[PDB]
Structure formats: C-alpha cells, structure tokens
Amino acid sequence: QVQLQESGGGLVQPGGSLRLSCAVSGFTLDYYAIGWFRQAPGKEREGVSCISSSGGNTKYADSVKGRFTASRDNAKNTFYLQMNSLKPEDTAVYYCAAIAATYYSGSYYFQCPHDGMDYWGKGTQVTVSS
Amino acid sequence: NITNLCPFGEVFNATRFASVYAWNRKRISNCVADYSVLYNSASFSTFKCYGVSPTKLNDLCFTNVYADSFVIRGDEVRQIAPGQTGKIADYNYKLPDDFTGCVIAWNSNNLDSKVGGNYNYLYRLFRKSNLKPFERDISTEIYQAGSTPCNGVEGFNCYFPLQSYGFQPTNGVGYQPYRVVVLSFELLAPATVCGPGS
Ligand SMILES: *[C@@H]1O[C@H](CO[C@H]2O[C@@H](C)[C@@H](O)[C@@H](O)[C@@H]2O)[C@@H](O[C@@H]2O[C@H](CO)[C@@H](O[C@@H]3O[C@H](CO)[C@@H](O)[C@H](O)[C@@H]3O)[C@H](O)[C@H]2NC(C)=O)[C@H](O)[C@H]1NC(C)=O
Fold first, then answer.
1. How far is the CA of A49 from the centre of ligand 1 (A)?
2. What are the residues of chain B with a beta carbon less than 8 Å away from any beta carbon of chain A?
3. 10 Å Cβ neighbour count for B191?
4. Could you count the other beta carbons within 10 Å of the beta carbon of residue B114?
5. Domain A2-128, what fold?
6. Checking DSSP bridges between strand B31-32 and strand B143-144, what pairing results, if any?
7. Domain map of chain A by residue range?
C-alpha cells in the first residue's frame, strides 16, 4: 500500500503556469512509475504524463508535449508536474497515480496505463479561464 | 489393480507458479486420484466446482484431466469463473460458460511476495479482443492504444502489453498473490484417470 497526496493547482489565466506536486507515502516498491492524468468536463479521463521512480523515462501526450514537464524530487518521494503556457482546454481535475514497473526478460518498463494504475490520488482542480 | 497416484502434489505444492498470461497446463493421465483429500484440505481459500461434486468425481473416469495453474491478485480470483469479465478473464485466462470442472485457489502471500516487490508475476493488460475459452497468449507485441501507430516501440499510447503485479507482503488481502489451480475433466480415448471408488 502507498498513498498519494496531491497539492498545487487552482485558477489561472490563459498563458499562465502551474506546478502540481504529488507526495508518495507508504511502502513503496523498488521500481515503480508515477503518472499524471486529467479529466475535463464532458470527456473521459486522459493520461498526461508518466515518469519512472528513477526520474527518467518521461513520456507525455502530444497535447501537452513541450508545455508540461514531469520531474521528481531528489531528496523526497514527491513528483512534480510543471505546466506552462496553459490554455482554457487544460481546465480539468488532475490526478496523480502510482503503478508498479514491469520486469520482463531482464528489462524494466516504466509505463502508466490507465486501467493498470494501482493507487490513485484524490485529484486537484485546475481552471484556466479569463 | 496397481496404478500410479495422479501427481497433484506436483501441481499444488510446486514452489514455482506460472504467470497468468502464460498459464501452465499439466495434462494428467493413467493414474488414480482421490479428489476429496484435495477438497477436504484446509489449504484452500476457494474450492468451487461447476461439473459434479468432488464426491461424485471419485466415481467417474476421464480420458484426460488438465491442471491449469497460475497466480493472480485476490480480488481477481472471482474472475476465474464462467461468464466473468475483467482483465484476467478477458485477456489472460477464460473459462467457458459450459465449464465442467473445479477452480481452486489459496492465499500465497507468504511465498509469492517480497519486500520491495516481486515483479516476476505478470498479467496481460491490453488486447484487441477477448480470449476464447482456454486460449493462451504469450505475445509481447506493442499495443497501440491511441490514434498514433507505433512501429514496435513503446510510446505514450503504445504499451508493453504485460504488467507486473508488484506483490509485497504489506499489500491488502485483495492485492495479495493467490495461486489458482483449474481442473478440467475431459472425456474423449481410454479413460485412465479415475477415483478410488471403483
Ligand atoms: C502438499 O503437502 C502437504 C503437506 O504439508 C505442507 O502443506 C503445504 C501447503 C505447506 O504448508 C508446507 O509447508 C507443508 O509441508 C500435504 O498435506 C499433508 O498430507 C498428509 C498426508 O498426505 C497429512 O498427514 C496426515 O494427517 C492426517 C490427519 O492429521 C492423518 O490421519 C494421517 O495419518 C497423516 O498424518 C498432513 O496433515 C497434511 N498437511 C496439511 C497441512 O495438509 C498435502 O496433501 C499436499 N498437497 C497435495 C495435493 O499433495
């Protein structure tokens, strides 16, 4: 069991920026992956970012690529999502989620598949409006 | 007469168990089996049958008996039943609606979990369509989940289709590892798998 506490977010004008934090507490695995997802009104929850417990293997949806950057604290079990150049379509509830990494044939894979995530956070509201 | 004992201990007391996506099947033949020393064991979390009572099975003979064994999560064992859906039943191990046999499971947290995570048990997360009853899939092709097609490389909409459970002894009971054994009673060939009741 691990627990995920989201922090950050709120209301911002178009062109603004934000930084989401997700603190990971409890019995963590040796190798896992943290993913950022978001759910906009009238749409299904979508993946936004994925990062390894190492801090690497970052991947992003082509809809936030170049604007969002996922990272990890080097002295803490906290994962950040820096969101730049926000547009009104970025308005959603953002969720942090944890999943085990996949070990197969001597190789590790760090993915954040929606249906596979093992632990979810409560989510935090992010509104980009004028 | 003289007959070999069906090697059920090689199935139930094995130190190693297969992943559910690559579920292991053992074909048992030419032997005698007491199906109630199995049923009358305090071992099992789950012992349901969809054919005939274990007491009735020590009467019948079958040409072949299959022992399918694998490991899944606790809250996943309910999927190993006819007419169930879910990641396991749809993509890893599927029982037919006309299933004639028994599903047996027990908690194996003490043996299949370790501190830091046991990544060796995997299940198939993605598949274009559901498995047909008793089919097995060990493919590892990249699954494209979005509009973008991937040419064999893992992307954001393109996943490795397998997923490690990450079993830890501190997990909740539903996320803990359970070993499952599915016995299928096939009747085709000579019926050389029987009970001790004839
Ligand atoms: C697998 O092995 C067990 C032996 O105990 C193991 O159980 C596993 C799950 C694990 O706990 C491991 O650490 C244990 O070593 C077999 O069960 C044993 O079977 C024998 C007889 O075959 C039982 O002894 C008998 O007990 C009865 C009643 O007490 C007496 O009337 C008999 O004279 C005889 O002493 C023993 O109690 C069983 N132990 C348990 C815990 O069941 C089990 O049969 C086997 N599984 C299969 C399918 O082969």
1. 51
2. 87, 116-117, 119-120, 122, 125-126, 140, 145, 148, 154-157, 159-160, 162-166, 168, 170-172, 175
3. 14
4. 13
5. Immunoglobulin-like (2.60.40)
6. unpaired
7. 2-128
